[PDB]
Amino acid sequence: SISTAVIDAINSGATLKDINAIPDDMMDDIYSYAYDFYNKGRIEEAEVFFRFLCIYDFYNVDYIMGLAAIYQIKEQFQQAADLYAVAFALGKNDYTPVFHTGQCQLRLKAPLKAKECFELVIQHSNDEKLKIKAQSYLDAIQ
């Protein structure tokens, strides 16, 4: 796409948010828009926002999760799984991206990688409700 002042942010290591002096309160408000539109099923708008937020701050786990959730909902399962892999590297001990990756892998016709995602969840997550679903998917996969 268009604006590659994104290439400068990359090699130099900064975020575009910092490069452009965007207030935290501004980012938070775009986040709230992104969150509300998403919960409201207004997926086209929410995607515009989450995309902006991910472009302006590629290191924000919550932005990466939002955009990956949108791609999951839109059945862009490869893009969702690629973003979940990034969100996992960032948050590096939340297993929610690993669980949702298992869901994506299943839709990408890769039940074995889906199974290892879910196993990874059970093996390491401390989240009970997440483990419960992981364990259900694991039981259902034969």
């Binding site: 938070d28 986040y31 709230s32 969150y35 998403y38 919960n39 919550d62 999760m65 939002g66 990956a68 959730a69 999951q72 909902i73 929610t96 949702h100 869901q103 679903k133």
Partner: peptide, 13 residues
């Protein structure tokens, strides 16, 4: 309340 709809971190309250 759907498992195929991820649940996102609520905006800092």
């Amino acid at each position: 309340s759907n498992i195929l709809i991820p649940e996102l971190k609520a905006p800092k309250s």
